[PDB]
Amino acid sequence: IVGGYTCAANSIPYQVSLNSGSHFCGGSLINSQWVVSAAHCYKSRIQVRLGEHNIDVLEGNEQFINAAKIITHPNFNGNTLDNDIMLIKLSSPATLNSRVATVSLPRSCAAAGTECLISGWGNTKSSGSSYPSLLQCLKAPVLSDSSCKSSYPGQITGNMICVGFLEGGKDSCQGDSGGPVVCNGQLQGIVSWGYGCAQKNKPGVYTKVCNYVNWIQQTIAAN
Numbered sequence: 001i002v003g004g005y006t007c008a009a010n011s012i013p014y015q016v017s018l019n020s021g022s023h024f025c026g027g028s029l030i031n032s033q034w035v036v037s038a039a040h041c042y043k044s045r046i047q048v049r050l051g052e053h054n055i056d057v058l059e060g061n062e063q064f065i066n067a068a069k070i071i072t073h074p075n076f077n078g079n080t081l082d083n084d085i086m087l088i089k090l091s092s093p094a095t096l097n098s099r100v101a102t103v104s105l106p107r108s109c110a111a112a113g114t115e116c117l118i119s120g121w122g123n124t125k126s127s128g129s130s131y132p133s134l135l136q137c138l139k140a141p142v143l144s145d146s147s148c149k150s151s152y153p154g155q156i157t158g159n160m161i162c163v164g165f166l167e168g169g170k171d172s173c174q175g176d177s178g179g180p181v182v183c184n185g186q187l188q189g190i191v192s193w194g195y196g197c198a199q200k201n202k203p204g205v206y207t208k209v210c211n212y213v214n215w216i217q218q219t220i221a222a223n
């Protein structure tokens with residue numbers, strides 16, 4: 001997260017870190033047994049780390065649970081990044097408490113201008129590289145359809161939204177991929193793609209979760 005602030009510890013209790021040896025992606029706990037992330041995060045083996053604040057220190061509230069199943073959306077396209085969504089079934093249920101909690105799926109899509117919260121352990125620098133120990137947070141609004149599609153001509157499908165700023169400086173970045181965009185209590189976005197991070201007129205593009213509630217629920221019921 002570039003241009004954000006450090007979240008209060010465990011204040012994003014649905015945020016997870018996906019670990020393959022090191023943190024590589026975010027995700028969101030939506031069911032006791034299921035995390036949703038981005039398809040471009042796929043790895044064949046993933047440990048899900050719940051309850052984290054400092055991903056470099058064991059602070060006690062963590063739950064480390066290996067993935068049992070990893071299911072990318074059948075229509076993910078790695079070029080266009082359409083359908084950039086993946087589900088991870090936990091090998092045992094997460095234990096839900098104040099620091100580990102589910103986040104609701106969307107009841108509707110979000111209006112333009114809706115305020116959201118984006119979080120992750122990704123790169124914090126707009127030039128160079130710094131990967132934080134502590135979870136970072138950013139407040140950002142859902143952008144207008146004209147602001148989003150003008151920024152990426154021909155590239156915004158109906159399964160994508162832009163959230164962020166057209167001025168440079170405030171965005172998600174590498175290592176935030178797969179993490180949440182929560183607006184009014186609902187997971188509306190998954191950190192997906194853009195052009196670099198926090199550059200002017202290149203806001204973050206996010207998987208539009210309100211189009212995927214049926215796919216999510218059907219995958220959970222079947223597995």
Ligand SMILES: NC(=[NH2+])NCCCO
Nearest residue numbers: 172173192193194204
């Ligand atoms: N603004 C961004 N480029 N965010 C997405 C992080 C890399 O997929």
Ligand SMILES: [Ca+2]
Nearest residue numbers: 054055057058
């Ligand atoms: Ca920790």
Ligand SMILES: [Mg+2]
Nearest residue numbers: 056057058059
């Ligand atoms: Mg140590």
Ligand SMILES: [Mg+2]
Nearest residue numbers: 056131132133
């Ligand atoms: Mg480090």
Ligand code: NA
Nearest residue numbers: 150151152201
């Ligand atoms: Na432009």
